[PDB]
């Protein structure tokens, strides 16, 4: 029955994409540069 196997497939992929988000929160955060919001806005709005 396809439904068993494509369900298995679909749940394993979900499980994988979610673990890939924990890794991206680790390696992509080294590139995050913080903004001085007060001087950005200090010209208008």
């Amino acid at each position: 029955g396809d439904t068993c196997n494509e369900e298995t497939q679909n749940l394993s992929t979900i499980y994988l994409r979610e673990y890939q988000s924990k890794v991206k929160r680790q390696i992509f955060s080294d590139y995050q540069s913080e903004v001085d919001i007060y001087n950005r806005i200090r010209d208008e709005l």
Binding site: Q20, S21, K24, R25, Q32, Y38, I41
Partner: protein, 103 residues
């Protein structure tokens, strides 16, 4: 002060909580005149915007609008799940007032 997003959202008129509990599907960012904004969408179909700064915003919000756009960019890029959104529902697309993330 409020302790949860649901508590903060009901002290405002025209707001509502959307429980999303999913990552952003798409992120759009515009620097075009009068449309300097961010638009995000979810798999489920909802589209939400961070509004262009304007007359209705007090000075303390003009700074928090820029912080929100930074949070949404890195949330999108790392695929972190958004738990709930509090939006003003009198805007099209609806307008983000507050976001929470968990885990």
């Amino acid at each position: 002060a409020p302790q949860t997003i649901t508590e903060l959202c009901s002290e405002y008129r025209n707001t509502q909580i959307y429980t999303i509990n999913d990552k952003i599907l798409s992120y759009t960012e515009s620097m075009a005149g009068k449309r300097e904004m961010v638009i995000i969408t979810f798999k489920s179909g909802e589209t939400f915007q961070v509004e262009v700064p304007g007359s209705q915003h007090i000075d303390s919000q003009k700074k928090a609008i820029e912080r929100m756009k930074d949070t949404l960019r890195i949330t999108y890029l790392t695929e972190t799940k958004i738990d709930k959104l509090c939006v003003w529902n009198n805007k099209t697309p609806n307008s983000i007032a507050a976001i929470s993330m968990k885990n």
